[PDB]
DNA sequence: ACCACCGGTGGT
DNA sequence: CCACCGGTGGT
Ligand SMILES: O=C(O)CNC(=O)C(=O)O
Ligand SMILES: [Cl-]
Ligand SMILES: [Fe+3]
């Protein structure tokens with residue numbers, strides 16, 4: 001690993017990593033995933049996706065899907081997207097780039113988190129501004145224009161800071177990982193309890209399904225316990241962000257730790273909680289640099305055509321829709337109605353845009369640090385009653401010092 | 414190079 | 426409100 005080519009050119013074959021899983025061929029991946037998940041056959045679904053490196057986006061630079069991978073039946077339990085690396089014959093020729101557990105957390109818990117997080121964050125949440133909230137031009141209105149109701153991200157836990165080259169709480173006597181508006185310890189305590197319990201629950205699923213990435217993220221658990229979430233032995237997570245009707249424009253999460261992954265737990269509005277329902281709107285998670293294969297897991301063309309006809313792979317067509325654009329770009333540190341369309345993305349077969357439609361209670365695992373990814377904008381974003389909430393669990397780089405890096409920073413001053 | 418980032422504290 | 430801390434991938 002590796003002599004297939006003299007140079008691994010990642011802009012040609014895609015980013016190379018094996019910590020979600022890797023093998024000589026697709027069959028080897030099924031064996032790995034069958035072993036990990038504890039079931040065989042129909043319970044596991046593998047889709048081959050192809051890295052094209054050409055980004056699907058609207059004429060305004062905002063996220064679009066060209067294909068949607070949807071849960072095929074209630075019998076399908078685990079979805080894995082795999083990349084067969086262009087021109088490789090070695091033991092890591094095929095790598096796993098996304099794992100989706102459809103039935104991730106109990107539905108009663110997912111129902112409750114959706115209510116409680118919506119209510120808490122609408123009343124007390126302080127929003128976190130991120131780069132990926134806007135397009136390149138900084139002029140789109142994908143989140144909505146009503147500041148009371150627009151899509152938003154709320155970040156909790158620990159985060160890396162360039163100022164300390166370590167945890168942002170380096171100088172905080174009593175850090176509040178779950179800081180809400182004002183100073184209401186009781187509401188923060190409730191929110192902490194929800195997210196800590198969820199961290200605790202998701203850790204063993206992470207270990208089960210992506211053991212190498214998991215084991216990477218727990219290597220320094222005992223050195224930096226204050227920079228970890230979770231209430232039981234085994235604490236891979238450090239930060240968590242709640243995204244409510246939030247359109248994440250194409251991005252990578254660049255200060256996530258090397259060789260780790262992100263877990264996304266999805267909660268949906270009450271009209272999208274039944275298999276085979278037709279919700280009024282939905283949000284998709286998109287890999288803009290990939291296209292779907294002409295062939296299914298096992299190499300059949302016909303089987304892939306079956307899936308396209310059944311809607312297990314939804315082939316989308318281009319749109320031409322009215323959208324808002326701000327008169328001034330949003331800064332660092334009025335609006336007009338414009339035409340937005342996706343026609344150019346659909347004319348080129350090699351422009352990417354593979355989406356998955358995560359369901360209520362599902363858990364998605366991907367290397368967000370390395371893979372370009374995005375979420376689609378809602379028709380009418382409303383964080384007071386969101387179409388989708390994502391809870392995104394991660395660990396940043398350089399979060400391996402005790403007490404949020406207090407001692408190390410003191411040594412510096 | 415060079416932009417822009419899932420920021421918090423202490424003192425006016 | 427303000428000054429104070431300044432690491433890097435993508436391009
Ligand atoms: O919500 C999702 O599915 C994707 N979220 C992100 O990529 C993010 O918050 O960085
Ligand atoms: Cl990641
Ligand atoms: Fe992301």
Ligand SMILES: [Zn+2]
Pocket residue numbers: 061062063134135140141142247249
């Ligand atoms: Zn946009």
Ligand SMILES: [Zn+2]
Pocket residue numbers: 002003004005087088089090091092093
């Ligand atoms: Zn090779």
Ligand SMILES: [Zn+2]
Pocket residue numbers: 158159167168169226227228403404
């Ligand atoms: Zn910390």
